Design a protein around this ligand. Sequence first.
Ligand SMILES: *SCC1=C(Br)C(C)(C)N(O)C1(C)C
Length: 164
Amino acid sequence: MNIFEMLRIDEGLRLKIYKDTEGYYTIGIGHLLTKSPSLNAAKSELDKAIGRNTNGVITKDEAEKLFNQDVDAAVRGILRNAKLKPVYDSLDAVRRAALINMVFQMGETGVAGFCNSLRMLQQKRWDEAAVNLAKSRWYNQTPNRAKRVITTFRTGTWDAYKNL
Ligand SMILES: *SCC1=C(Br)C(C)(C)N(O)C1(C)C
């Protein structure tokens, strides 16, 4: 397991524009296009992102290209953020993947707002951090995914992604 395989499990792979868990137009491996409710605005975002006139469908290779860009972007957003960088640096490689996963799903700003959780992770109080991470809109709206990410932070293992 690694961050790409982990997010591929959590986000799936769909080659046609679809609505994510929040109702927002998305494509590929969890690539958010727009929060606009207009499908035409989502198709324009897709065409800009891929560099061609797509009308809403992409190839697997194109989905994987956006995914590489999005993982890179989540890591660089962590390292550019004064709240997230020190936490990332303090973690082992498995827990770093969990933090990348959360930033991929909810964005740099969203995760950096989890101050109490981030502090417990920096302190390596893993069970306390896990309890605290579950007290969130995130957990309530995507509980199975959040449980997998939280088990990853609690244990520093990939056990929640095994048999997936
Ligand atoms: S991370 C939120 C905060 C905590 Br736990 C203490 C240390 C009490 N603070 O002063 C805040 C609000 C920064």
